[PDB]
Amino acid sequence: SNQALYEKLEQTRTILSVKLAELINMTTIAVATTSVMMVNNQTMQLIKNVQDLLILTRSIKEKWLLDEKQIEELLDNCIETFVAEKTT
Amino acid sequence: VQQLSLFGSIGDDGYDLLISTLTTISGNPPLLYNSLCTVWKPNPSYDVENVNSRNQLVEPNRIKLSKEVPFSYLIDETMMDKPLNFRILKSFESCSPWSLQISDIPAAGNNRSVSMQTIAETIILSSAGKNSSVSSLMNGLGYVFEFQYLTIGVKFFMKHGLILELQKIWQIEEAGNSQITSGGFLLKAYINVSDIDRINYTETALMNLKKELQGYIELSVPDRQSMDSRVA
Amino acid sequence: KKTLRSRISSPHGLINLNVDDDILIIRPILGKVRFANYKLLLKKIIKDYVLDIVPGSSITETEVENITKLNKEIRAFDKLLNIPRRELKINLPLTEHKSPNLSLMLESPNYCNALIHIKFSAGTEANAVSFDTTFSDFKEVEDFLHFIVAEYIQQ
Amino acid sequence: PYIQERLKSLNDIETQLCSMLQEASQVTFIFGELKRGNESVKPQFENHVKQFYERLDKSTTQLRKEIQLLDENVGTRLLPQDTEKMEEQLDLLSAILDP
């Protein structure tokens, strides 16, 4: 089940790097507005990926986080003093 | 008595992990224990028919005598001053009371979820007279000593009467004791049942334990023939 | 400690407890006081009926599988959880023909009431007597002490 | 403790990620500078951008190894008293008796 975390994390890393470089290529290069929208999309996806890394780290952290005579003498005194039976 | 059980095993190296797992799963650390078993068979020099007074077939079987021994009898000098706890296992006039048992080959059935064995037992408390040794008494019944083995291990008390034993077995002979379990521990999970309900309930308890250890250690039903003490 | 022990040793399974059996903290404790009272009256009775009557006499009270580590811990508190009992031995002067001996034991089996056990033997093997008695009532111990001192202890 | 070390390492990884983000920002703005014809930042743009990728790569190597260590520690360092009370009270009791 942890191997799944490893896979998801690796895929996430590749996705993040690739999306960063590829977005860096996409700009520089209403078509311009469309390109800007696409840039926004890629960047947003990257941020979401960062949050995903945070989720993974948190998951790992949570995985980590989730004689006798002495007594007989002592009671002998205690019981005596408590009854106050002495009375003489 | 009906004993429902499942068995498994682990190598010496799997010890600590298993102890840690069973301690968390059951809530209690292990308890050290031992037992000496002596098996007896009908005297071969004597021979009797194998039938009732009613002329009904009776199968000859072995009788098992078992008791404990004080741990001090199992610790030599090299063993001296070593925490008398679960870790010790790694570094491996009249008669006394005994448990006398005769068991039957487990119940038949394909796809059994557990092994189910009937066990006839009585308790020997003491003896007196000419030949009072347990050995003589067994002879008086017409039996002779065949073999004997020592078992040392740790046990865990769990819910619903489920007991788990992690054991090591040594056969005993003057020629020397040989460890039948050389390499690791024999794992045993069982419940003793004195109504169909309690039997299906007990099966469930064992099945849940098997389920709870699936992936880590597997518990299965041993071969009936491997749990048959009949003489032949 | 007891519940755990009850679980370790026997059950292969779960605990079984009773309030009545398992009841005693405070009730077992109060008995300590009532017993002290009881012991006081008893000593008064003894002075009156015995000590004052026979001159030399006096009185001396006296104390009456491997889980073992657990049993040792619980055993330590047997002092507090035992049914309270003291033995009062009465010292009597030795007659040169025979030495009479008398002793009483006070106890509270249910913790709040009293039983009084009296043993008397003054042996002269011609006259030899032995009494072993139990009384739940101080009224009857006065009557029996009186009976005893009268016939056997007195000159 | 060991778990404390693991958590500390994870926190360090978080810091690394944060750094990566910051230098992503730097990279973007300074790319904006380079496109406008300011080449003076070419050293600083590429530096921050390259230091980003280096930091991100270092974090990836550190994080992936940490996940592997967690998997290897299963069953070892990682999961798959009333006698203490009594000693407290006895201590308390002898202290009352002998203040």
Coordinates of C-alpha atoms in Angstrom, one line a residue:
Chain A
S1 CA 0.0 0.0 0.0
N2 CA 3.0 2.2 0.5
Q3 CA 4.3 1.3 -2.9
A4 CA 1.2 3.0 -4.3
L5 CA 2.3 6.1 -2.4
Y6 CA 5.7 5.8 -4.0
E7 CA 4.3 5.4 -7.4
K8 CA 1.8 8.3 -7.0
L9 CA 4.6 10.5 -5.7
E10 CA 7.0 9.7 -8.5
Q11 CA 4.3 10.2 -11.1
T12 CA 3.6 13.5 -9.4
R13 CA 7.2 14.6 -9.5
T14 CA 7.6 13.8 -13.2
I15 CA 4.3 15.6 -13.9
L16 CA 5.5 18.6 -12.0
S17 CA 8.9 19.0 -13.6
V18 CA 7.6 18.2 -17.1
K19 CA 4.7 20.6 -16.7
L20 CA 7.0 23.3 -15.5
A21 CA 9.4 23.0 -18.4
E22 CA 6.7 22.6 -21.0
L23 CA 4.8 25.6 -19.6
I24 CA 8.0 27.5 -19.9
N25 CA 8.1 26.5 -23.5
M26 CA 4.4 27.2 -24.1
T27 CA 5.1 30.9 -23.2
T28 CA 7.2 32.3 -24.9
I29 CA 5.5 30.1 -27.4
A30 CA -7.7 35.8 -29.4
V31 CA -5.0 33.1 -29.9
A32 CA -2.7 34.9 -27.4
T33 CA -5.5 35.0 -24.8
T34 CA -6.0 31.2 -25.3
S35 CA -2.3 30.7 -24.8
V36 CA -2.5 32.7 -21.6
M37 CA -5.4 30.6 -20.4
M38 CA -3.4 27.4 -21.2
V39 CA -0.5 28.9 -19.2
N40 CA -2.9 29.5 -16.2
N41 CA -4.1 25.9 -16.5
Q42 CA -0.5 24.4 -16.5
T43 CA 0.6 26.6 -13.6
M44 CA -2.5 25.8 -11.6
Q45 CA -1.9 22.1 -12.2
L46 CA 1.6 22.5 -11.0
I47 CA 0.5 24.2 -7.8
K48 CA -2.1 21.5 -7.2
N49 CA 0.8 19.0 -7.6
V50 CA 2.7 20.8 -4.9
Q51 CA -0.3 20.5 -2.6
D52 CA -0.3 16.8 -3.6
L53 CA 3.4 16.5 -2.4
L54 CA 2.2 18.1 0.8
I55 CA -0.5 15.5 1.1
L56 CA 2.0 12.7 0.6
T57 CA 4.4 14.1 3.3
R58 CA 1.5 14.5 5.7
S59 CA 0.5 10.9 5.0
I60 CA 4.1 9.7 5.8
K61 CA 4.2 11.7 9.0
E62 CA 0.8 10.3 10.1
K63 CA 2.1 6.8 9.3
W64 CA 5.0 7.5 11.7
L65 CA 2.8 9.0 14.4
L66 CA 0.0 6.4 14.4
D67 CA 9.1 -4.9 48.8
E68 CA 6.7 -7.1 50.8
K69 CA 8.0 -6.5 54.3
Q70 CA 8.3 -2.8 53.5
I71 CA 4.7 -2.8 52.6
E72 CA 3.6 -4.9 55.5
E73 CA 5.4 -2.5 57.9
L74 CA 4.0 0.5 56.1
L75 CA 0.4 -0.7 56.2
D76 CA 0.8 -1.7 59.9
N77 CA 1.6 1.9 60.7
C78 CA -1.1 3.3 58.4
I79 CA -3.9 1.1 59.8
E80 CA -2.8 1.9 63.4
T81 CA -2.7 5.6 63.0
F82 CA -5.9 5.6 61.1
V83 CA -8.0 3.8 63.8
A84 CA -6.5 5.8 66.6
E85 CA -7.3 2.7 68.7
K86 CA -4.3 3.3 70.9
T87 CA -6.2 5.8 73.1
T88 CA -4.0 5.3 76.1
Chain B
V1 CA -13.1 -32.8 24.2
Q2 CA -13.0 -31.3 20.7
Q3 CA -9.8 -29.3 19.8
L4 CA -10.2 -26.9 16.8
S5 CA -6.9 -25.7 15.5
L6 CA -4.8 -24.1 12.8
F7 CA -1.0 -24.3 12.3
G8 CA 1.8 -22.2 10.9
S9 CA 5.5 -21.6 11.3
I10 CA 8.3 -19.1 11.1
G11 CA 12.1 -19.3 11.0
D12 CA 14.2 -18.2 14.0
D13 CA 14.7 -14.8 12.5
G14 CA 11.0 -14.2 12.4
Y15 CA 10.7 -14.5 16.1
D16 CA 10.9 -10.9 17.4
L17 CA 8.6 -9.6 14.7
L18 CA 6.0 -12.3 15.4
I19 CA 6.2 -11.7 19.2
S20 CA 5.8 -8.0 18.7
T21 CA 2.8 -8.6 16.4
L22 CA 1.1 -11.1 18.7
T23 CA 1.7 -8.8 21.7
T24 CA 0.0 -5.9 20.0
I25 CA -2.8 -8.0 18.6
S26 CA -3.6 -9.8 21.8
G27 CA -2.7 -7.0 24.3
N28 CA -0.4 -9.2 26.4
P29 CA 3.3 -10.1 26.1
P30 CA 4.2 -13.9 25.8
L31 CA 4.2 -16.4 28.6
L32 CA 7.1 -19.0 28.8
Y33 CA 6.1 -22.7 29.2
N34 CA 7.3 -26.2 28.6
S35 CA 6.0 -29.8 28.6
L36 CA 7.3 -33.3 28.4
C37 CA 5.3 -35.9 26.5
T38 CA 5.9 -39.6 26.6
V39 CA 4.1 -41.7 24.0
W40 CA 3.2 -45.4 24.7
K41 CA 2.0 -48.2 22.5
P42 CA 0.4 -51.6 23.0
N43 CA 3.2 -54.1 24.0
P44 CA 4.2 -55.8 20.8
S45 CA 5.3 -59.0 22.8
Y46 CA 1.7 -59.4 24.0
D47 CA -0.9 -59.8 21.4
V48 CA -4.6 -59.5 21.6
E49 CA -7.4 -59.6 19.1
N50 CA -8.6 -56.2 18.0
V51 CA -12.2 -56.6 19.0
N52 CA -14.9 -55.8 21.6
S53 CA -16.6 -58.1 24.1
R54 CA -19.4 -57.2 21.7
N55 CA -17.1 -58.4 18.9
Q56 CA -16.8 -54.9 17.5
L57 CA -13.6 -53.6 15.8
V58 CA -11.3 -51.6 18.0
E59 CA -8.3 -49.8 16.5
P60 CA -5.0 -49.9 18.5
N61 CA -3.8 -46.5 19.5
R62 CA -1.0 -44.7 21.3
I63 CA -1.4 -43.2 24.8
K64 CA 0.2 -39.8 25.5
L65 CA 1.4 -38.8 28.9
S66 CA 2.2 -35.2 29.5
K67 CA 3.3 -33.0 32.3
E68 CA 5.4 -29.9 33.0
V69 CA 8.9 -29.6 34.4
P70 CA 10.4 -26.7 36.4
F71 CA 12.2 -24.4 33.9
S72 CA 15.4 -24.8 35.9
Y73 CA 15.7 -28.3 34.5
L74 CA 16.1 -26.9 31.0
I75 CA 18.7 -24.2 31.7
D76 CA 22.4 -25.3 31.7
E77 CA 25.5 -23.3 32.5
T78 CA 26.0 -21.0 29.5
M79 CA 22.2 -20.4 29.7
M80 CA 22.8 -19.1 33.3
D81 CA 21.7 -15.6 34.0
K82 CA 19.7 -14.8 30.9
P83 CA 16.4 -13.0 31.3
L84 CA 13.9 -15.8 31.9
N85 CA 11.5 -14.4 29.3
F86 CA 10.5 -15.0 25.6
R87 CA 14.0 -14.3 24.4
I88 CA 15.4 -17.4 26.0
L89 CA 14.0 -19.6 23.3
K90 CA 16.3 -18.1 20.7
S91 CA 19.4 -19.5 22.5
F92 CA 18.3 -23.1 21.9
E93 CA 8.4 -42.9 45.6
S94 CA 5.1 -42.5 43.8
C95 CA 4.5 -41.0 40.3
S96 CA 4.0 -37.4 39.5
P97 CA 0.7 -36.1 38.2
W98 CA 0.3 -36.6 34.4
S99 CA -2.2 -35.9 31.7
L100 CA -3.2 -39.1 29.9
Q101 CA -4.6 -38.6 26.4
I102 CA -5.8 -40.7 23.4
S103 CA -6.7 -38.7 20.3
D104 CA -8.7 -39.5 17.2
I105 CA -7.6 -38.7 13.6
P106 CA -9.2 -35.3 12.8
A107 CA -12.8 -35.1 11.4
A108 CA -13.0 -35.9 7.6
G109 CA -14.1 -33.3 5.1
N110 CA -12.9 -31.5 2.0
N111 CA -12.4 -27.8 2.4
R112 CA -12.3 -27.8 6.2
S113 CA -11.8 -24.3 7.6
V114 CA -10.0 -25.7 10.6
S115 CA -8.7 -29.0 11.9
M116 CA -11.1 -30.6 14.5
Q117 CA -9.8 -33.4 16.8
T118 CA -11.5 -35.4 19.5
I119 CA -9.4 -36.1 22.5
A120 CA -10.0 -38.5 25.4
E121 CA -8.2 -37.4 28.5
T122 CA -8.0 -38.3 32.1
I123 CA -5.7 -37.2 34.9
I124 CA -3.2 -39.3 36.8
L125 CA -2.7 -37.8 40.3
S126 CA -0.6 -40.4 42.1
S127 CA 0.3 -44.1 42.7
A128 CA 1.2 -46.6 45.3
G129 CA 2.2 -50.3 45.7
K130 CA 4.9 -52.6 44.3
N131 CA 5.3 -51.1 40.9
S132 CA 4.1 -47.5 41.4
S133 CA 6.3 -45.8 38.7
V134 CA 4.2 -44.4 35.8
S135 CA 6.2 -46.8 33.6
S136 CA 5.1 -49.9 35.5
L137 CA 1.5 -48.6 35.5
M138 CA 1.6 -48.2 31.7
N139 CA 3.0 -51.7 31.5
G140 CA 0.2 -52.9 33.8
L141 CA -2.3 -51.6 31.2
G142 CA -0.4 -53.5 28.6
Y143 CA 1.6 -50.7 27.1
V144 CA 5.3 -49.9 26.5
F145 CA 7.3 -46.8 26.2
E146 CA 7.8 -45.8 22.5
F147 CA 9.2 -42.3 22.3
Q148 CA 9.1 -38.9 24.1
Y149 CA 9.6 -35.2 23.2
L150 CA 10.1 -31.9 25.0
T151 CA 8.4 -28.8 23.9
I152 CA 9.4 -25.3 25.0
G153 CA 7.6 -22.1 23.9
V154 CA 5.6 -19.0 24.7
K155 CA 1.8 -18.8 24.7
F156 CA -0.7 -16.0 24.4
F157 CA -4.2 -15.9 25.9
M158 CA -6.7 -14.2 23.6
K159 CA -10.4 -13.7 23.4
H160 CA -13.0 -16.4 23.4
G161 CA -10.6 -19.0 24.7
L162 CA -8.2 -18.7 21.8
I163 CA -4.7 -19.7 22.6
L164 CA -1.6 -19.2 20.5
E165 CA 1.6 -21.2 21.0
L166 CA 5.0 -20.6 19.4
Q167 CA 6.9 -23.8 20.0
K168 CA 10.1 -25.6 19.6
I169 CA 10.2 -29.4 19.9
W170 CA 13.0 -31.8 20.8
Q171 CA 12.8 -35.6 20.7
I172 CA 14.7 -37.1 23.7
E173 CA 17.0 -40.2 23.6
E174 CA 20.3 -41.1 25.2
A175 CA 21.8 -40.8 21.8
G176 CA 20.8 -37.2 22.1
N177 CA 17.9 -34.8 21.7
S178 CA 17.3 -33.7 18.1
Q179 CA 15.3 -30.6 17.4
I180 CA 12.3 -31.6 15.3
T181 CA 11.6 -27.9 14.7
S182 CA 15.2 -27.0 13.8
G183 CA 15.2 -23.7 11.9
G184 CA 12.2 -22.0 13.5
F185 CA 9.0 -22.3 15.5
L186 CA 5.8 -24.3 15.1
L187 CA 2.9 -22.0 15.4
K188 CA -0.4 -23.3 16.8
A189 CA -3.7 -21.6 17.4
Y190 CA -6.5 -23.5 19.0
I191 CA -9.6 -23.6 21.1
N192 CA -10.9 -26.5 23.3
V193 CA -14.6 -27.2 23.0
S194 CA -16.4 -29.4 25.5
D195 CA -23.7 -27.8 20.5
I196 CA -23.1 -27.1 16.8
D197 CA -23.3 -23.3 17.6
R198 CA -20.2 -23.1 19.8
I199 CA -18.5 -25.2 17.2
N200 CA -19.3 -22.8 14.3
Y201 CA -18.5 -19.9 16.6
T202 CA -15.1 -21.3 17.5
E203 CA -14.4 -21.8 13.8
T204 CA -15.2 -18.2 13.3
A205 CA -12.7 -17.1 16.0
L206 CA -10.0 -19.1 14.4
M207 CA -10.9 -17.8 10.9
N208 CA -10.8 -14.2 12.1
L209 CA -7.3 -14.8 13.5
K210 CA -6.2 -16.4 10.3
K211 CA -7.7 -13.4 8.4
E212 CA -6.0 -11.0 10.8
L213 CA -2.6 -12.6 10.1
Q214 CA -3.1 -13.1 6.3
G215 CA -0.3 -11.4 4.4
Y216 CA 2.1 -11.7 7.4
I217 CA 1.9 -15.4 8.6
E218 CA -0.3 -18.0 7.2
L219 CA -2.4 -20.5 9.3
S220 CA -3.8 -23.6 7.7
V221 CA -5.3 -27.0 8.3
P222 CA -2.7 -29.7 8.6
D223 CA -3.1 -33.1 6.9
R224 CA -5.4 -35.4 8.9
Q225 CA -3.0 -38.3 8.4
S226 CA -0.3 -36.2 10.2
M227 CA -2.4 -36.0 13.3
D228 CA -3.2 -39.7 13.5
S229 CA -1.6 -41.6 16.4
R230 CA -3.0 -45.1 15.7
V231 CA -0.5 -48.0 15.7
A232 CA -0.1 -50.0 12.5
Chain C
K1 CA -4.3 -6.7 40.1
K2 CA -6.9 -9.3 40.8
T3 CA -8.9 -8.8 37.5
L4 CA -5.7 -9.1 35.5
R5 CA -4.7 -12.2 37.4
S6 CA -8.2 -13.6 37.0
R7 CA -7.6 -13.0 33.3
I8 CA -4.0 -14.3 33.1
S9 CA -4.4 -17.6 34.8
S10 CA -7.8 -19.2 34.4
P11 CA -10.2 -18.0 31.8
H12 CA -8.6 -18.4 28.3
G13 CA -11.3 -15.9 27.9
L14 CA -12.6 -13.1 30.1
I15 CA -12.9 -12.0 33.8
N16 CA -15.6 -12.8 36.2
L17 CA -16.2 -10.6 39.2
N18 CA -18.8 -9.9 42.0
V19 CA -19.5 -6.7 43.8
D20 CA -20.1 -8.7 47.1
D21 CA -16.9 -10.7 46.5
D22 CA -15.2 -7.8 44.8
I23 CA -17.0 -5.2 46.9
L24 CA -14.4 -4.3 49.5
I25 CA -12.7 -1.0 49.5
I26 CA -14.7 1.1 52.1
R27 CA -16.9 -1.6 53.7
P28 CA -13.8 -3.7 54.3
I29 CA -12.2 -0.6 55.8
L30 CA -14.9 0.4 58.3
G31 CA -14.6 -3.0 60.1
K32 CA -11.2 -1.8 61.2
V33 CA -12.8 0.7 63.5
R34 CA -15.7 -1.4 64.8
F35 CA -13.2 -4.2 65.6
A36 CA -11.1 -1.7 67.7
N37 CA -14.3 -0.9 69.6
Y38 CA -15.2 -4.6 70.0
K39 CA -11.6 -5.3 71.2
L40 CA -11.9 -2.6 73.8
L41 CA -15.1 -3.9 75.4
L42 CA -13.6 -7.4 75.3
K43 CA -10.6 -6.2 77.3
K44 CA -12.9 -4.4 79.8
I45 CA -15.0 -7.6 80.3
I46 CA -11.7 -9.6 80.8
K47 CA -10.5 -7.1 83.4
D48 CA -13.7 -7.2 85.3
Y49 CA -14.4 -10.9 85.2
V50 CA -10.9 -12.2 85.3
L51 CA -8.0 -9.8 85.9
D52 CA -9.7 -8.3 89.0
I53 CA -10.7 -11.6 90.4
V54 CA -7.4 -13.5 90.0
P55 CA -4.5 -11.4 91.3
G56 CA -1.5 -12.4 89.3
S57 CA -3.3 -12.4 85.9
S58 CA -2.6 -10.3 82.9
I59 CA -3.3 -10.2 79.2
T60 CA -1.1 -10.4 76.0
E61 CA -2.4 -9.8 72.5
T62 CA -0.8 -11.5 69.5
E63 CA -1.1 -11.4 65.7
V64 CA -2.9 -14.5 64.5
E65 CA 1.5 -21.5 37.1
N66 CA 3.9 -18.7 37.5
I67 CA 2.1 -15.4 38.0
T68 CA 3.9 -15.3 41.4
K69 CA 5.1 -11.7 41.0
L70 CA 1.4 -10.8 41.0
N71 CA 0.4 -12.9 44.0
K72 CA 3.3 -11.4 45.9
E73 CA 2.0 -7.9 45.2
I74 CA -1.5 -8.8 46.4
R75 CA -0.2 -10.8 49.3
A76 CA 1.4 -7.6 50.6
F77 CA -2.0 -6.1 51.1
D78 CA -3.4 -9.2 53.0
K79 CA -2.7 -7.0 56.0
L80 CA -5.4 -4.6 54.9
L81 CA -7.8 -7.2 53.4
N82 CA -7.7 -9.9 56.0
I83 CA -10.7 -10.5 58.2
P84 CA -9.6 -8.7 61.4
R85 CA -8.5 -11.0 64.2
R86 CA -6.6 -10.7 67.5
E87 CA -5.8 -13.3 70.1
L88 CA -5.9 -12.2 73.7
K89 CA -4.0 -14.7 75.9
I90 CA -4.7 -14.5 79.6
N91 CA -1.7 -15.1 81.7
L92 CA -2.7 -17.0 84.9
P93 CA -0.5 -17.8 87.9
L94 CA 0.9 -21.3 87.9
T95 CA -0.6 -23.6 90.6
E96 CA 2.2 -26.0 91.6
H97 CA 0.0 -29.0 90.9
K98 CA -1.3 -27.8 87.5
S99 CA -0.9 -24.8 85.1
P100 CA -4.3 -23.5 83.9
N101 CA -4.3 -21.8 80.5
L102 CA -6.9 -19.5 79.1
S103 CA -7.1 -17.4 75.9
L104 CA -9.7 -15.6 73.8
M105 CA -9.7 -14.7 70.1
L106 CA -11.8 -12.0 68.7
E107 CA -12.7 -11.9 65.0
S108 CA -15.1 -10.3 62.5
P109 CA -15.9 -12.8 59.8
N110 CA -18.3 -10.6 57.8
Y111 CA -16.2 -7.5 58.9
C112 CA -18.8 -5.7 60.9
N113 CA -19.8 -8.2 63.7
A114 CA -17.8 -10.0 66.3
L115 CA -17.1 -13.6 67.2
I116 CA -15.4 -14.4 70.5
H117 CA -13.5 -17.7 70.8
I118 CA -12.6 -18.9 74.2
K119 CA -10.3 -21.8 75.0
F120 CA -9.7 -23.1 78.5
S121 CA -7.7 -26.0 79.8
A122 CA -6.5 -26.5 83.3
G123 CA -5.2 -30.0 83.3
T124 CA -4.6 -32.2 86.3
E125 CA -4.8 -35.5 84.4
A126 CA -7.2 -36.7 87.1
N127 CA -9.2 -33.4 86.9
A128 CA -8.2 -32.4 83.3
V129 CA -10.7 -30.2 81.4
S130 CA -10.8 -28.7 78.0
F131 CA -13.2 -26.1 76.6
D132 CA -13.4 -24.9 73.1
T133 CA -16.1 -22.3 72.7
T134 CA -17.6 -19.7 70.3
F135 CA -19.9 -16.8 71.2
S136 CA -21.5 -14.1 69.2
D137 CA -22.7 -12.2 72.3
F138 CA -20.6 -10.4 75.0
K139 CA -23.4 -11.2 77.5
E140 CA -22.6 -14.9 77.2
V141 CA -18.8 -14.4 77.3
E142 CA -19.3 -12.7 80.7
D143 CA -21.4 -15.7 81.9
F144 CA -18.9 -18.2 80.6
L145 CA -15.8 -16.4 82.0
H146 CA -17.6 -16.2 85.3
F147 CA -18.3 -19.9 85.2
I148 CA -14.7 -20.7 84.3
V149 CA -13.0 -18.5 86.9
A150 CA -15.5 -19.7 89.5
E151 CA -15.0 -23.4 89.4
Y152 CA -11.5 -23.9 87.9
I153 CA -9.4 -20.8 88.4
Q154 CA -10.5 -19.7 91.9
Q155 CA -9.1 -21.1 95.1
Chain D
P1 CA 14.1 9.5 18.7
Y2 CA 14.1 7.8 15.3
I3 CA 10.6 9.0 14.5
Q4 CA 11.7 12.5 15.4
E5 CA 14.6 12.2 12.9
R6 CA 12.1 11.0 10.2
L7 CA 9.8 13.9 10.9
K8 CA 12.7 16.3 10.8
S9 CA 13.8 15.0 7.5
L10 CA 10.3 15.3 6.1
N11 CA 10.1 18.9 7.3
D12 CA 13.4 19.6 5.6
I13 CA 11.9 18.2 2.4
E14 CA 9.0 20.6 2.8
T15 CA 11.4 23.5 3.1
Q16 CA 13.1 22.3 -0.1
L17 CA 9.8 22.3 -1.9
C18 CA 9.1 25.8 -0.8
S19 CA 12.5 26.9 -2.1
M20 CA 11.6 25.3 -5.5
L21 CA 8.4 27.3 -5.6
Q22 CA 10.1 30.6 -4.8
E23 CA 12.8 30.1 -7.5
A24 CA 10.0 29.2 -9.9
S25 CA 8.6 32.7 -9.3
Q26 CA 12.0 34.2 -9.8
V27 CA 12.5 32.3 -13.0
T28 CA 9.2 33.5 -14.4
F29 CA 9.7 37.2 -13.6
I30 CA 13.2 37.2 -14.9
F31 CA 12.2 35.4 -18.1
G32 CA 9.8 38.3 -18.4
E33 CA 12.8 40.6 -18.1
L34 CA 14.9 38.7 -20.7
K35 CA 12.0 38.9 -23.3
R36 CA 11.9 42.7 -22.9
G37 CA 15.6 42.9 -23.9
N38 CA 17.3 43.0 -20.5
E39 CA 20.1 40.5 -20.7
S40 CA 21.8 41.6 -17.5
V41 CA 19.5 39.3 -15.6
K42 CA 20.4 36.3 -17.9
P43 CA 23.0 35.1 -15.3
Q44 CA 20.5 35.6 -12.4
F45 CA 17.4 34.3 -14.3
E46 CA 19.1 31.1 -15.3
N47 CA 20.8 30.8 -11.9
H48 CA 17.5 30.9 -10.0
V49 CA 15.8 28.7 -12.5
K50 CA 18.6 26.2 -12.5
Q51 CA 19.0 26.4 -8.7
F52 CA 15.3 25.6 -8.7
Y53 CA 15.6 22.5 -10.8
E54 CA 18.6 21.4 -8.7
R55 CA 16.7 22.0 -5.5
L56 CA 13.6 20.2 -6.8
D57 CA 15.8 17.3 -8.0
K58 CA 17.5 17.1 -4.6
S59 CA 14.1 17.1 -2.9
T60 CA 12.9 14.3 -5.2
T61 CA 16.0 12.2 -4.4
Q62 CA 15.5 12.9 -0.7
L63 CA 11.7 12.2 -0.6
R64 CA 11.8 9.0 -2.7
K65 CA 14.5 7.6 -0.4
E66 CA 12.5 8.5 2.7
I67 CA 9.5 6.7 1.4
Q68 CA 11.7 3.6 0.7
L69 CA 13.0 3.8 4.3
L70 CA 9.5 3.7 5.6
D71 CA 8.7 0.6 3.6
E72 CA 11.8 -1.1 4.8
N73 CA 11.0 -0.2 8.4
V74 CA 7.7 -2.0 8.5
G75 CA 7.7 -4.6 11.2
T76 CA 11.1 -3.4 12.5
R77 CA 10.9 0.2 13.8
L78 CA 7.3 0.6 12.6
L79 CA 4.0 -1.2 13.5
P80 CA 2.4 -3.0 10.6
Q81 CA 1.0 -0.1 34.2
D82 CA -0.9 -0.5 37.5
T83 CA 2.3 -1.5 39.3
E84 CA 3.3 2.1 38.4
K85 CA 0.2 3.4 40.1
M86 CA 0.8 1.4 43.2
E87 CA 4.4 2.6 43.6
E88 CA 3.0 6.2 43.4
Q89 CA 0.6 5.6 46.3
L90 CA 3.1 3.7 48.5
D91 CA 5.5 6.6 47.9
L92 CA 2.7 8.9 48.8
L93 CA 1.8 6.9 51.9
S94 CA 5.3 6.5 53.4
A95 CA 5.7 10.3 52.8
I96 CA 2.6 11.0 54.8
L97 CA 3.7 8.7 57.6
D98 CA 7.2 10.2 57.6
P99 CA 7.0 13.8 56.4

